[PDB]
Amino acid sequence: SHSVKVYDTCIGCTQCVRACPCDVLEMVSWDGCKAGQIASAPRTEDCIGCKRCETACPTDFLSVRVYLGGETTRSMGLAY
Amino acid sequence: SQFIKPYNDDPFVGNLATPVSTSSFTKSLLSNLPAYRAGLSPLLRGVEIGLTHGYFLVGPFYKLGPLRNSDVALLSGFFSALGLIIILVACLTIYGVVSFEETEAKDQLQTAKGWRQFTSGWLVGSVGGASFAYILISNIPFLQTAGMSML
Amino acid sequence: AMSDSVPFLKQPEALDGSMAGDVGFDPLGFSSIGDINFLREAELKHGRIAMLAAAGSIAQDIFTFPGVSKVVGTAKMTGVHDILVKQGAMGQLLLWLSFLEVFGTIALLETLDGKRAPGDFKFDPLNFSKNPETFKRYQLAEIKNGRLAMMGVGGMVHGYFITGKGPLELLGNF
Amino acid sequence: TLNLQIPSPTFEGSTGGWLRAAEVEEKYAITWTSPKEQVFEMPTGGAAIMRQGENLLYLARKEQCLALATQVKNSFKITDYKVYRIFPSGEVQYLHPKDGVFPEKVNAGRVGVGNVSHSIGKNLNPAQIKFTSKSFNG
Amino acid sequence: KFEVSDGTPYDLNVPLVGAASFIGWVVPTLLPSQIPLYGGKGLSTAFFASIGTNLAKFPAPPGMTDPFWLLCFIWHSGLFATMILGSIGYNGYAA
Amino acid sequence: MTAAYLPSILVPIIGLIFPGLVMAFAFIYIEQD
Amino acid sequence: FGGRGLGVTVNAERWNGRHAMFGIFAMVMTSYMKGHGLIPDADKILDVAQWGSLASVWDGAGNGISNERAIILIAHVHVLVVSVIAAVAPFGFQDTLVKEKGYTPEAPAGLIPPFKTGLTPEAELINGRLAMLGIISIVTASVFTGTPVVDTINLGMGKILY
Amino acid sequence: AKSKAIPFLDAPPALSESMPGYVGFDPLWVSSMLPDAGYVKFLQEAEIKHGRVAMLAAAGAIVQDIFTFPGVTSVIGNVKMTSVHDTFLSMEGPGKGNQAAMHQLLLWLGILEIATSVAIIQSFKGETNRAPGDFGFDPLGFSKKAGAETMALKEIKNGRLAMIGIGGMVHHYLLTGKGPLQFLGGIPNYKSCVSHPDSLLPWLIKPVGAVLPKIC
Ligand code: CLA
Ligand code: CLA
Ligand code: CLA
Ligand SMILES: CC1=C(C#C/C(C)=C/C=C/C(C)=C/C=C/C=C(C)/C=C/C=C(\C)C#CC2=C(C)C[C@@H](O)CC2(C)C)C(C)(C)C[C@H](O)C1
Ligand SMILES: CC1=C(C#C/C(C)=C/C=C/C(C)=C/C=C/C=C(C)/C=C/C=C(\C)C#CC2=C(C)C[C@@H](O)CC2(C)C)C(C)(C)C[C@H](O)C1
Ligand SMILES: CC1=C(C#C/C(C)=C/C=C/C(C)=C/C=C/C=C(C)/C=C/C=C(C)/C=C/C2=C(C)CCCC2(C)C)C(C)(C)C[C@H](O)C1
Ligand SMILES: CC1=C(C#C/C(C)=C/C=C/C(C)=C/C=C/C=C(C)/C=C/C=C(C)/C=C/C2=C(C)CCCC2(C)C)C(C)(C)C[C@H](O)C1
Ligand SMILES: CC1=CCCC(C)(C)[C@H]1/C=C/C(C)=C/C=C/C(C)=C/C=C/C=C(C)/C=C/C=C(C)/C=C/C1=C(C)CCCC1(C)C
């Protein structure tokens, strides 16, 4: 599966979670930013690797990062 | 009066029920083919399929091969058909080796023993059909000239 | 279970034995592919046309109508057709038989719905078949003579193709 | 819990539906409730009419289900949709929304997975972690 | 009980459509023409005469310049058009 | 050419039997679990 | 591989012994038929205009395969087709070439199996090992002396064949 | 379980002793070559047809030596065993000649054989419980006679014997050119060989000169 990391530069804008087509990311409680929330990736086995979350991230260099790894049926987006 | 319906009454499967796919003529022809006909061992399915395919394999090799203008054109064409048959039998064997787990079930094509039986039948049928085509073309001048002997 | 005509074959499913001349003879299973009533109407039309052709071949060997020998000369059987295509007799026959066969097509539509027996045109002006037993005997005789006539017309026309004589002249000058 | 007896939208069928891997590896299901019968676009290609009431639909991929969910959310204001994973054995795994609350909203009990406690520029060099099972994050 | 699809029983009406389309195409094409392709006959009759002429010369196929190919193509084109339109009209309207 | 039979013996073997057996055994090796 | 009866197995020893016994027979019969001139037109050089480019040998004279060599190869082609069909579609009673994965290997016979005369597997294995050794010895005696293999057989059998 | 004909070999698994003429003789296990139930029946039917055809061959090969039908020698000459097939076919065909004897035989026998094909297909699948080789042809009622319980054994035995016999007589004609009765009475047949035309498979007699002795 692909690996998705969220670094502590996250401002909790929830844009990466809204951009995710595969429901990989979610918002959890945090105290490191003014929004009081940070992104997390509990479901990276469903990650296709499209990097729409990285496109959605507004922080100078990204807070959410996708590292493409081992390809599975889900990560390759195969309907067969 | 609609001629195209969802396949197997399932609108979300990736198929459509069409006159080419699901008519009575198509269903009868498909259910009566040796690959699908009921009551056949996989060996006999192989025998019928091999007889047909090996029988027609002689013709293009005989008429269009590099030895087609020689007196040994039919012998060369049959030998080329036999080599193709042996190559295809090796293909069938390696497909069955990598595709199937060793199970007790042997009455179905998609089992290891069933595929081995099908391969054996296909080899014997292909050799027999090619030999029958060789005999008929060797002994009938109509088949040697593809009808030009009548002119 | 087994057929009567061919004892080593299973009886055809579409052959119940109700139609006249049914001895379970369908080794190729044509009644399983085509409709049995369509095949029966075809069999009766081929057989009746063959009965007329056989009787006509024999009678045209026996005698010709007045003035026919002026136009046809010594031509017999098949040889007449071409000549009388030019004179116009075959055109008139084609016209009026086609006109009758339009209503025959409507009758085929009736029999394919199941509302008409095959070959039944209700044509009994002389009331020969007033008894259903005599009707059954006449149906059997009609279908047997129709099939025999199909064989006969085949033999007569191919014997004429070989020798050029005709049926009765070949029977005499063999 | 996925009710298998939920009626499906009226669809004429297509060649874009699920293949043999749906019945062999895994399949996905999406249910939602509509206030009226209305035409939506299938994620596999074609137009279907969702019925008034509950709708159950089967797809090959999770992304197809979530695309359909986004379409019915942004075009028909339908937010009650549920996405499940179904295995050949009959096991149904509820997927979305995982805890009942949508992932873009914070919910109690959620724990952070994959969070790194420094900026992305503080990752280790590959030469530092070569021939060693240390992660590049530190 | 011919099913045209998985669960769609449909009457093909092959006898009526074939007979009616054959008669409705052959009879208008009995109209004669003095052009050398027809030879003084109608399209159907010139086609049948060409069939007889080329069957009198078995093995030997009709040549490229022989009128058989053009007669066959036009006759079967009109016949197929008549059969398609007749199937549409009789199977659909049925009245 | 001395031992002129050797090209006609070895070229069909090396060009058809060797790649066929290699492709078959490599297929079995890469597809087996 | 080894779980199917291929490699250094008793199955492979038996199969190569059978083929070697047949090979000794075929070499003796080849020497007999060639010595008596029973191969028709044995020195006729096959022509490329009839048999194609496969007949080309590129020797110093003729550039074609001799008819005897082609006839010997066709005789081998017959039993090769028999071999392919017996390997893929064996008789129900017959010993198979490749064995199933869960098969029971035949015990190695050691120096010599028990002395069961007749149509026994022990006699088959003994004569098979003997025939393989005989092929080795005949080849070595042919290539260390320059005597042709048919002639080496004819001298080793004391000119009985011809 | 061992064979009755071959007491040391094991009995073939597909033979049940139900069929007449079984003595356990199938060393190649041909009856086990297909797992299907009707296959053995198919085999038996083939055997029956072979024997019957062979019987009609063998008697014919004798009777064609004794007398010929009127006008036959004016058409084909003095050919005896397999050059009749060749000579008729040389004079058969539109354009090639006027006879149609072998083609007429092929036509009517092919009608009978297609009608037989349907029966073999039906008996193979199990839609019919008819015995192999049984066509219901008993117009003279010998099955309702006495001693009819061994007629099938005599049929199969004389069938096999006629198979071997016609193989004999044909391979004798191909070498000597005599025919059955002259071959039987002319015991040293290599001292007086009748000149005969080559068959329609002349390549098969090619090794007789070079490979084989060619005594004749
Ligand atoms: C080629 C011959 C031909 C043509 C032109 C038509 C035409 C027509 N039929 Mg029809 N029919 C035919 C043969 C034909 N039929 C035969 C053989 C049968 C018997 C099986 C029937 C049985 C039948 C029934 C039972 C009914 C019709 C009806 C109709 C009408 C509307 C339905 C339709 O098909 O519209 C077709 C539309 C057009 C042809 C006009 C569009 C023109 C474009 C350019 C297409 C034409 C293609 C081409 C030029 C045709 C060339 C013909 C070729 C032979 C040269 C229409 C006038 C129905 C109706 O309402 O009429 C009473 C009806 O109830 N037909
Ligand atoms: C170096 C490899 C190699 C070799 C040795 C050959 C050899 C040959 N090719 Mg060629 N070929 C090759 C590569 C090769 N090809 C490639 C890569 C292509 C693709 C572009 C082709 C495409 C090609 C075509 C399209 C044709 C040939 C033909 C021929 C034959 C020449 C004509 C002749 O006399 O045939 C006479 C032929 C025979 C007497 C029949 C021989 C049958 C053999 C002995 C059976 C062998 C069975 C099999 C290999 C068993 C092993 C299976 C196992 C590997 C799984 C000859 C056997 C022609 C031919 O005749 O094909 C038969 C022909 O039509 N070739
Ligand atoms: C026309 C061929 C023919 C056929 C199809 C059969 C069929 C049958 N015979 Mg039969 N038989 C025949 C001729 C035939 N017979 C003749 C001529 C004789 C007299 C010698 C016999 C004597 C005989 C006996 C004594 C017995 C049978 C039995 C049987 C039945 C068991 C299956 C079997 O053995 O068939 C296999 C035979 C064939 C299919 C004939 C074709 C030959 C095969 C295919 C050759 C294999 C090919 C390959 C090249 C091997 C040849 C070389 C090899 C020997 C090294 C079966 C119904 C048994 C039976 O029914 O018991 C009640 C039995 O005991 N047969
Ligand atoms: C229904 C209706 C009725 C009507 C009616 C109709 C008019 C009935 C009329 C019927 C006739 C036409 C029946 C004809 C049968 C002909 C066949 C059987 C003979 C075939 C010859 C074969 C054997 C042969 C040939 C042979 C070979 C091949 C070639 C030759 O060398 C030799 C040879 C000749 C021997 C009427 C009007 C009564 C009123 C009634 O109220 C209802
Ligand atoms: C069904 C049944 C019945 C039927 C019936 C009839 C049709 C039965 C027909 C039967 C046939 C004629 C039986 C023929 C057997 C031939 C064999 C035994 C002799 C073979 C040759 C030997 C081996 C030899 C050879 C030899 C060697 C090789 C070479 C030669 O130099 C010498 C020689 C020639 C001696 C009927 C119709 C009555 C009705 C009933 O209701 C139902
Ligand atoms: C002239 C000519 C040409 C031509 C041409 C052309 C253009 C040909 C045109 C042909 C046409 C228009 C044919 C129409 C046929 C209609 C039929 C038979 C309807 C049958 C209806 C039925 C049976 C309905 C039955 C019914 C039934 C059972 C149930 C309900 C009631 C009812 C509806 C009555 C060229 C151009 C090629 C050139 C050539 O050189 C000469
Ligand atoms: C008409 C025609 C032609 C033709 C033709 C024909 C009809 C040719 C030949 C046909 C046939 C059927 C030949 C049969 C040969 C049988 C053999 C050798 C049996 C051996 C049996 C043995 C050894 C039994 C052994 C035994 C067994 C099994 C059991 C134990 C006892 C034992 C004795 C040991 C041509 C080709 C000339 C062409 C021409 O243009 C047209
Ligand atoms: C034309 C037609 C019209 C248009 C539409 C269409 C349907 C697409 C088209 C069909 C095109 C195609 C589909 C036409 C259909 C074609 C196929 C290719 C016909 C194959 C026939 C195989 C038979 C003859 C071999 C039979 C075995 C014999 C008896 C063997 C005996 C052997 C056995 C083993 C035992 C040993 C002896 C020997 C001799 C070795």
PDB file of N, CA and C in Angstrom, chain F residues 3-31:
ATOM      1  N   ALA F   3      32.626 -30.550 -40.349  1.00  0.00           N
ATOM      2  CA  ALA F   3      31.457 -30.820 -39.505  1.00  0.00           C
ATOM      3  C   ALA F   3      30.286 -29.926 -39.909  1.00  0.00           C
ATOM      4  N   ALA F   4      29.949 -30.006 -41.197  1.00  0.00           N
ATOM      5  CA  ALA F   4      28.902 -29.174 -41.772  1.00  0.00           C
ATOM      6  C   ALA F   4      27.513 -29.540 -41.268  1.00  0.00           C
ATOM      7  N   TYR F   5      27.349 -30.726 -40.682  1.00  0.00           N
ATOM      8  CA  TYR F   5      26.073 -31.119 -40.100  1.00  0.00           C
ATOM      9  C   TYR F   5      25.734 -30.313 -38.854  1.00  0.00           C
ATOM     10  N   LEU F   6      26.747 -29.781 -38.171  1.00  0.00           N
ATOM     11  CA  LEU F   6      26.527 -29.084 -36.907  1.00  0.00           C
ATOM     12  C   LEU F   6      25.670 -27.821 -37.000  1.00  0.00           C
ATOM     13  N   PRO F   7      25.796 -26.931 -38.005  1.00  0.00           N
ATOM     14  CA  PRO F   7      24.803 -25.841 -38.104  1.00  0.00           C
ATOM     15  C   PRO F   7      23.369 -26.315 -38.263  1.00  0.00           C
ATOM     16  N   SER F   8      23.117 -27.263 -39.167  1.00  0.00           N
ATOM     17  CA  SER F   8      21.761 -27.762 -39.365  1.00  0.00           C
ATOM     18  C   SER F   8      21.234 -28.536 -38.161  1.00  0.00           C
ATOM     19  N   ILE F   9      22.111 -29.080 -37.318  1.00  0.00           N
ATOM     20  CA  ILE F   9      21.645 -29.717 -36.090  1.00  0.00           C
ATOM     21  C   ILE F   9      21.376 -28.679 -35.003  1.00  0.00           C
ATOM     22  N   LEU F  10      22.312 -27.751 -34.795  1.00  0.00           N
ATOM     23  CA  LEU F  10      22.281 -26.900 -33.613  1.00  0.00           C
ATOM     24  C   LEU F  10      21.448 -25.638 -33.772  1.00  0.00           C
ATOM     25  N   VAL F  11      21.395 -25.047 -34.972  1.00  0.00           N
ATOM     26  CA  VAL F  11      20.633 -23.808 -35.160  1.00  0.00           C
ATOM     27  C   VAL F  11      19.136 -23.982 -34.906  1.00  0.00           C
ATOM     28  N   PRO F  12      18.445 -25.020 -35.437  1.00  0.00           N
ATOM     29  CA  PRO F  12      17.047 -25.212 -35.009  1.00  0.00           C
ATOM     30  C   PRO F  12      16.879 -25.477 -33.523  1.00  0.00           C
ATOM     31  N   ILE F  13      17.796 -26.224 -32.901  1.00  0.00           N
ATOM     32  CA  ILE F  13      17.699 -26.487 -31.466  1.00  0.00           C
ATOM     33  C   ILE F  13      17.865 -25.198 -30.669  1.00  0.00           C
ATOM     34  N   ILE F  14      18.948 -24.461 -30.925  1.00  0.00           N
ATOM     35  CA  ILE F  14      19.243 -23.234 -30.190  1.00  0.00           C
ATOM     36  C   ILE F  14      18.191 -22.158 -30.454  1.00  0.00           C
ATOM     37  N   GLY F  15      17.659 -22.089 -31.668  1.00  0.00           N
ATOM     38  CA  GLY F  15      16.681 -21.067 -31.969  1.00  0.00           C
ATOM     39  C   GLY F  15      15.226 -21.402 -31.712  1.00  0.00           C
ATOM     40  N   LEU F  16      14.878 -22.681 -31.528  1.00  0.00           N
ATOM     41  CA  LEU F  16      13.473 -22.986 -31.278  1.00  0.00           C
ATOM     42  C   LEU F  16      13.230 -23.791 -30.011  1.00  0.00           C
ATOM     43  N   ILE F  17      14.123 -24.713 -29.660  1.00  0.00           N
ATOM     44  CA  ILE F  17      13.911 -25.590 -28.517  1.00  0.00           C
ATOM     45  C   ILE F  17      14.365 -24.922 -27.234  1.00  0.00           C
ATOM     46  N   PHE F  18      15.563 -24.336 -27.268  1.00  0.00           N
ATOM     47  CA  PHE F  18      16.059 -23.557 -26.135  1.00  0.00           C
ATOM     48  C   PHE F  18      15.128 -22.412 -25.736  1.00  0.00           C
ATOM     49  N   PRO F  19      14.661 -21.521 -26.633  1.00  0.00           N
ATOM     50  CA  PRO F  19      13.737 -20.481 -26.160  1.00  0.00           C
ATOM     51  C   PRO F  19      12.381 -21.018 -25.743  1.00  0.00           C
ATOM     52  N   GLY F  20      11.880 -22.081 -26.374  1.00  0.00           N
ATOM     53  CA  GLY F  20      10.608 -22.649 -25.948  1.00  0.00           C
ATOM     54  C   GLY F  20      10.659 -23.226 -24.544  1.00  0.00           C
ATOM     55  N   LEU F  21      11.699 -24.014 -24.248  1.00  0.00           N
ATOM     56  CA  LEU F  21      11.862 -24.566 -22.903  1.00  0.00           C
ATOM     57  C   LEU F  21      12.154 -23.478 -21.872  1.00  0.00           C
ATOM     58  N   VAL F  22      12.959 -22.472 -22.236  1.00  0.00           N
ATOM     59  CA  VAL F  22      13.222 -21.361 -21.321  1.00  0.00           C
ATOM     60  C   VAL F  22      11.950 -20.573 -21.038  1.00  0.00           C
ATOM     61  N   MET F  23      11.157 -20.275 -22.070  1.00  0.00           N
ATOM     62  CA  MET F  23       9.926 -19.518 -21.870  1.00  0.00           C
ATOM     63  C   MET F  23       8.908 -20.312 -21.061  1.00  0.00           C
ATOM     64  N   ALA F  24       8.806 -21.623 -21.305  1.00  0.00           N
ATOM     65  CA  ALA F  24       7.885 -22.463 -20.541  1.00  0.00           C
ATOM     66  C   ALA F  24       8.284 -22.539 -19.070  1.00  0.00           C
ATOM     67  N   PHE F  25       9.563 -22.817 -18.796  1.00  0.00           N
ATOM     68  CA  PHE F  25       9.998 -22.956 -17.412  1.00  0.00           C
ATOM     69  C   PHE F  25      10.009 -21.619 -16.685  1.00  0.00           C
ATOM     70  N   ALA F  26      10.349 -20.530 -17.380  1.00  0.00           N
ATOM     71  CA  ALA F  26      10.276 -19.203 -16.782  1.00  0.00           C
ATOM     72  C   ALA F  26       8.837 -18.803 -16.502  1.00  0.00           C
ATOM     73  N   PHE F  27       7.909 -19.176 -17.387  1.00  0.00           N
ATOM     74  CA  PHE F  27       6.487 -18.948 -17.153  1.00  0.00           C
ATOM     75  C   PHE F  27       6.011 -19.678 -15.904  1.00  0.00           C
ATOM     76  N   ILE F  28       6.383 -20.958 -15.778  1.00  0.00           N
ATOM     77  CA  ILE F  28       6.032 -21.750 -14.601  1.00  0.00           C
ATOM     78  C   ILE F  28       6.629 -21.135 -13.339  1.00  0.00           C
ATOM     79  N   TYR F  29       7.874 -20.663 -13.427  1.00  0.00           N
ATOM     80  CA  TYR F  29       8.552 -20.096 -12.268  1.00  0.00           C
ATOM     81  C   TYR F  29       7.927 -18.771 -11.839  1.00  0.00           C
ATOM     82  N   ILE F  30       7.638 -17.883 -12.792  1.00  0.00           N
ATOM     83  CA  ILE F  30       7.114 -16.573 -12.421  1.00  0.00           C
ATOM     84  C   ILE F  30       5.632 -16.608 -12.083  1.00  0.00           C
ATOM     85  N   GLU F  31       4.902 -17.657 -12.464  1.00  0.00           N
ATOM     86  CA  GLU F  31       3.484 -17.689 -12.137  1.00  0.00           C
ATOM     87  C   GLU F  31       3.146 -18.562 -10.936  1.00  0.00           C
TER      88      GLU F  31
END
